[PDB]
Design an enzyme around this catalytic site. Structure first.
Site, mmCIF file in Angstrom:
data_model
loop_
_atom_site.group_PDB
_atom_site.id
_atom_site.type_symbol
_atom_site.label_atom_id
_atom_site.label_comp_id
_atom_site.label_asym_id
_atom_site.label_seq_id
_atom_site.Cartn_x
_atom_site.Cartn_y
_atom_site.Cartn_z
ATOM 1 N N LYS A 46 0.800 -1.222 0.000
ATOM 2 C CA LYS A 46 0.000 0.000 0.000
ATOM 3 C C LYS A 46 0.841 1.285 0.000
ATOM 4 O O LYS A 46 0.405 2.324 -0.498
ATOM 5 C CB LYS A 46 -0.902 -0.024 1.219
ATOM 6 N N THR A 103 4.279 1.570 -1.304
ATOM 7 C CA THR A 103 4.946 1.675 -2.611
ATOM 8 C C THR A 103 4.124 2.523 -3.578
ATOM 9 O O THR A 103 4.508 3.631 -3.929
ATOM 10 C CB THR A 103 5.186 0.292 -3.228
#
Ligand SMILES: Nc1nc(=O)c2nc(CNc3ccc(C(=O)N[C@@H](CCC(=O)O)C(=O)O)cc3)cnc2[nH]1
Lengths: 557, 557
Positions: free
Chosen positions: A72, A74
Site C-alpha cells: 500500500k 509503494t
C-alpha cells in the site's frame, strides 16, 4: 538484472534535506539536521503559513489485506514521484516503522522497489529517536504511578485496576504478562501488568493526533491510569505527569523530513496501530505538508474498512481536514484469494475467481463514496498478472462507477504510476469532494458503532458481552460518551470473523470488550484478542544480522 | 551575584560545532551533526592519526564525597577553560548523565555556575541517543534469551540461573524484582528477574571500554547471560546476538562533540556506574582527544578510592594510557565533615576539624603517588571559608607534598582556574609521571582485592561470605581469574561502612557477593547492598516540571 530493495536504497543519490527544505521555502533555522540527509522541521512552518492556501489532500488506502500482500505504501510513494515528474509541488507523508520487527521477521523498505523513502536503514532503526521519546513518556508515567503507590497512595488507587502498562519497541512475548513491585516494603507495591510494543502506546496515538506540543501536553494530562478503590478515574492529570511527558517529547513533536528515491520531499512522522488506534501518520506532518504543497499524498493502516474510515472520522474530524481525492490500492492476486484461491494457486491465472473477489473492492469503493469523497482506483502490477485478468477488473470498476488506472512503480519508478497521476488531477479539477463525517459525536456509543458496523463493514447488527455493556454504561456515565470510536477488530475480513473473505453478508459483529483512550480521545471496542506485543519467531533475523569491519550490514533486509 | 546554573547555560553563545571540528583538524566528512551544536565524530579520525603522539592526559578526581558537596566536574570544565585561556590546545572528556535523575532529584549542570559544557538541556535528556541505543542493545539480548527458552531451550539454560537482567533509564523501583513470561505456554517461560537503570547496563560498560565497533561486537559475544542445568556458562555469542547488538550501537560508538560555555571543545561519551563499573567516559572519546589536542582533561566517578583507581587500573590498562597528572578536588566544608562537624555547622570556622579531616585528603594524595602520578589539589572556594581555614589547607597540602591551587571557576569561569592551570602546567614541565597500575592481572582475585583494599582503602584485611567464596572458586575454574577487579562499595568512606568518615583505621572489608562482566572484561566484588536501580523520592521533581507555549521550561532545574 535482479536488484533487491536494500541495494536500490544504498545506490541512490540522496539530496541534502537542507536544500530540499529550501526547495519548499523552509528557512535555514526551521531545520535541525540529523546527518546530511535527515532533519526535523520546526512547528513554525505551520504557525507562520497558518492561513496560506492548504493544497489538495490525497489519502491512499487499500482493499482488505491478504497473505498475498498488496504494498500500500509503494504505490503511495511511486505516485508522489509521478506528480512531481509532471512538475507539481507534492509531499508524501508516511509512518515511522517500529524497530522491533527488524530483528524478528526482517525490516522492509519504506514503500518498495523504485518507490522508496530513504535512507531506509535509519528509518527502520533509531531514525530521529521519535519512538524512544514516546517510550520514555509512557514509561515515566508508568513509573510515576508505581512511585505514587509507594509514597502512600495519596490518591487512593486500587492497583488491581491500573490500566496503564509499560512499552518497549522489541517483540518480546515474555513481557506480555508479568508481576512487578516485589521484594517487600522497600521495593514498591506488588501488582499485575505487562508490556506492549511502543508503537501501540496511547502516547504514540496522542503524538499522531495532537495539533501542537501544548495540545500534546493536555491530552497527556487527560489519560486514565486506573481507578480509586471507590471507582473514580485517576488521570495523568492527577499525577502532574503531563509536564514531564511533553518535555520528553519536545523534539519528537517535530516531523522528520526525508526523501524519495527520486528526491521527492517526504515526511515520516508517527506510526500507531491501525486496530486499537487509527494507523495514520501524524496530523502535524500532513498539516505542515498542506501549507507546503498543493498536493499531499498520505496513507492509513490496514484495509479501507479500518484505516480510511478512521482516517476520515477521527483524523480529519479532529483536524478540520477535508480530503479531496482518495486512492484504493489492489492487486489481482489479492482479489483471487478473496475469490477463494490459495496462495500456491495464484501462479496460474483464475479469471473466474477474480470476478468473485472484486465484491471486496467494490464494497470499499461504495464506502469511500459514503463520506462525500471522490474515490479512485489503482492496480499494483506483477510478473504473473495476465492481461485477461487486468482487463476483467479494469471494466468492472467503471461498471462500478469511479476512475481506474495501472501502476508499475515497484519496477518503473514514478513513471509506471504516471498514468494514475493524471487521473487524480483529472479527478481534482473535475471532481470536487463533499466531505462529511460518517457519524456525529452526539449520538451515544452503541449508535456510533452501529452506524459504523452497519454501513461500512456491511453487517446486519452488533452484539455485546456482559462486560461490554458494563464497560459502556460505566463510560457514558463517567462522561466519556461523546468520543469517536476506533474499531479494534481483525483486518482480513469486513466481519470480525477473520476467515470470512470477499464481501460476506448476513453475519453480525460482536463487541467482546470496550476500552478507553482518554488522552488520544477515543473509545476502543474490541472484537478479537488483540496482539499488542508480537513475538520473535523460531529462527529470528537477529541471529543472522551482522555488521562487519566496514559498516556493511548483512541480514537486516 | 551569580545567576543560577540553567539560565547561565541558555544565554551562553555557542559556536557551530563543525567550526570547532575543522579547528581541530576534523574533516567535514567525518562529522554527523545533531543541530548546530552537537555532532557525532567518526572513528576514522583516530584511525588516520593513530601514529601521531598523544597530548598530555590530566585526570580529575576528588576526596571522599560528603553530603556537603565537592563539585568535581565544575573543576574539570573550569580547568579546561583556563588551559584554553593560557593558549593551550585542550579538550575535556566527560560522561553522559543518566536521563532518570532529571525527574526524581532534578537534573543538574554538566559542571555548574560558569564551568559547564553546553547545550545543557539536550545533554540531560536524549542527547544523541547513546543511552537509548544502549537500552535496546541490552534488551534485545533479554528478549533473545527469553525467545530461546520459548523455542525449545536448545542450549539447555536453567532459566533460574539467568543473570542478564533488563534495563531502563528511569528511576523505577517497582521494576527491581519482577516475574516475567506468565500467561501460559504461549507467553514465554515464567521466571524471576528485574530491571536496572540503563547506565548500569554491562553494555554501557562495554561501550566505554571498547576500542571500536568490532572490538565492541567481540565483547558482546562474551557476555554471560546464565548457565545450563549442567552448570556450563551460556554467552550472548551462543545466542548469536552480537551482530544485532553491534548494529544497534552503530551510531552509539561515535563520541559526541560539544563545547564549554567559553567554547572549549568537549567530548561527552558513555557513562557507566562507578561502583559496579569503572565510572569513566569511553576510551574512544578520550583516545581521540589525545590525538586532536596537546592536553586532555577527563574525570572519574566518585572519590579517588574508586574512580581514580579504576581509571588507572582498568581504563588506562586497556588503552595503554599513562596519565601525566592528577588533580584532586576538595573543599573546606567536606573536609570539616570528615573531621567530624555536622552538616548544619559547616559554616562555623574550625581549624581543628579541618586538620582532622585533612587526613582524608592526605590519604588520597598518597594513593595517587602509588600509581606514580604527580598530584595537584584544587580547592573549590566557598564564600563562608575564612582566610585562616584556606591558609591552613595550603600549609597542609604543601606539608603533604602536593601543589595546591584555590579554584573559583564556578564563580568566574576560566579565569577562576588560571592559577590551578598554571600549577598543572608547572607540574607537567618538571614532574613527569611514572605510570604503572596498582596490580598485575596474574594475581588471584583475592590477591587483587586485598591489594586495592589495603593499599588504597587502608583496610586491615578482607572478609568473604561463603557465597562469595564459591563464586570466586567458580569464576576461577571457569578461567576468569586473571581479570581486573572492580570494587562496588560505598563511596562515602574508604571503608565499606558509609558512616566512617575521614581516614578510618583498624577496619576490614566484607565482600558479600562477587559478580562477573565477561563482556567488559572484569570481576565485580560487592560489599554493601548495591542499588543498581534507585527509586523516585517522596515528591519527584517530575511533579513540578512543565514547558509552556513559548517552550519555557520550568521546574526542571
Ligand atoms: N554550590 C556552590 N559552589 C561554589 O563553589 C560557590 N561559590 C560561591 C562564591 N565563591 C567564593 C569562593 C571563595 C571565596 C573565598 O574563599 N575568598 C577568599 C580567597 C582566599 C585565598 O585566595 O586564599 C578571599 O580572600 O576573598 C569567596 C567566594 C557562591 N556559591 C557557590 N555555590
Amino acid at each position: 538484472k535482479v536488484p533487491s530493495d536494500i541495494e536500490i536504497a544504498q545506490a541512490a543519490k540522496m539530496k541534502p534535506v537542507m536544500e530540499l527544505a529550501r526547495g519548499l521555502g523552509i528557512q535555514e533555522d526551521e531545520v535541525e539536521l540529523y546527518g546530511k540527509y535527515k532533519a526535523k522541521i520546526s512547528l513554525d512552518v505551520y504557525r507562520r503559513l497558518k492561513d496560506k492556501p492548504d493544497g489538495k489532500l490525497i489519502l491512499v488506502t487499500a482493499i482488505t489485506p491478504t497473505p498475498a500482500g498488496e504494498g500500500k505504501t509503494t504505490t503511495s510513494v511511486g505516485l508522489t514521484d509521478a506528480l512531481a515528474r509532471l512538475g507539481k509541488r507534492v509531499m508524501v507523508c508516511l509512518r515511522e516503522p517500529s524497530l522491533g520487527p527488524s530483528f524478528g521477521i526482517k525490516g522492509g523498505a519504506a514503500g518498495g522497489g523504485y518507490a522508496q523513502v530513504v535512507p531506509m536503514e535509519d528509518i527502520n532503526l533509531h531514525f530521529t529517536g521519535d519512538i524512544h521519546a514516546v517510550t520514555y513518556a509512557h514509561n515515566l508515567l508508568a513509573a510515576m504511578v508505581d512511585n505514587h503507590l509507594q509514597q502512600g497512595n495519596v490518591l487512593n488507587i486500587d492497583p488491581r485496576t491500573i490500566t496503564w502498562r509499560r512499552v518497549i519497541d522489541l517483540n518480546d512475548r515474555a513481557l506480555r504478562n508479568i508481576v512487578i513491585g516485589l521484594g517487600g516494603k522497600a521495593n514498591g507495591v506488588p501488582r499485575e501488568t505487562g508490556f506492549d510494543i511502543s508503537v501501540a502506546s496511547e502516547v504514540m496515538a496522542c503524538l499522531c493526533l495532537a495539533s501542537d506540543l501544548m495540545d500534546l501536553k493536555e491530552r497527556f494530562s487527560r489519560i486514565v491510569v486506573g481507578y480509586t478503590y471507590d471507582g473514580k478515574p485517576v488521570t495523568a492529570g492527577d499525577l502532574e505527569a503531563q509536564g514531564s511527558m511533553a518535555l520528553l517529547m519536545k523534539d519528537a513533536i517535530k516531523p522528520n523530513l526525508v526523501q524519495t528515491l527520486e528526491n521527492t520531499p517526504a515526511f515520516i512522522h508517527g506510526g500507531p496501530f491501525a486496530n486499537i488506534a487509527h494507523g495514520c501518520n501524524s496530523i502535524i506532518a500532513t498539516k505542515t505538508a498542506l501549507k507546503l504543497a498543493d498536493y499531499v499524498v498520505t496513507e492509513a493502516g490496514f484495509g479501507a474498512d479500518l484505516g480510511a474510515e478512521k482516517f476520515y472520522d477521527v483524523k480529519c474530524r479532529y483536524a478540520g481536514f477535508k480530503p479531496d481525492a482518495t486512492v484504493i490500492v489492489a492487486t489481482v492476486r489479492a482479489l483471487k484469494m478473496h475469490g477463494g484461491v490459495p496462495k500456491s494457486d495464484l501462479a496460474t491465472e483464475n479469471l473466474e475467481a477474480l470476478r468473485e473477489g472484486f465484491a471486496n473492492l467494490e464494497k470499499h469503493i461504495e464506502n469511500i463514496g459514503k463520506f462525500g469523497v471522490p474515490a479512485v482506483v489503482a492496480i499494483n502490477a506483477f510478473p504473473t498478472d495476465t492481461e485477461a485478468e487486468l482487463n476483467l477488473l479494469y471494466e468492472l470498476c467503471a461498471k462500478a462507477g469511479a476512475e481506474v488506472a495501472l501502476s508499475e512503480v515497484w519496477a518503473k519508478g514514478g513513471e509506471g504510476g504516471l498514468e494514475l497521476a493524471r487521473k487524480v488531477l483529472q479527478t481534482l479539477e473535475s471532481r470536487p469532494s463533499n466531505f462529511h463525517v460518517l457519524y456525529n459525536l452526539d449520538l451515544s456509543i452503541k449508535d456510533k458503532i452501529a452506524k459504523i458496523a452497519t454501513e461500512i463493514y456491511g453487517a446486519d447488527g452488533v452484539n455485546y458481552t456482559a462486560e461490554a455493556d458494563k464497560a459502556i454504561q460505566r463510560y457514558e456515565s463517567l462522561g466519556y460518551g461523546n468520543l469517536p470510536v476506533v474499531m479494534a477488530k481483525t483486518q482480513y475480513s469486513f466481519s470480525d470473523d477473520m476467515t470470512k473473505l470477499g464481501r460476506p453478508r448476513n453475519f453480525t459483529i460482536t463487541v467482546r470488550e470496550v476500552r478507553l483512550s482518554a488522552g488520544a480521545g477515543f473509545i476502543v471496542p474490541i472484537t478479537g484478542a488483540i496482539m499488542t506485543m508480537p513475538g520473535l519467531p523460531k529462527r529470528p533475523a537477529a541471529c543472522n544480522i551482522d555488521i562487519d569491519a566496514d559498516g556493511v550490514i548483512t541480514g537486516l533486509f
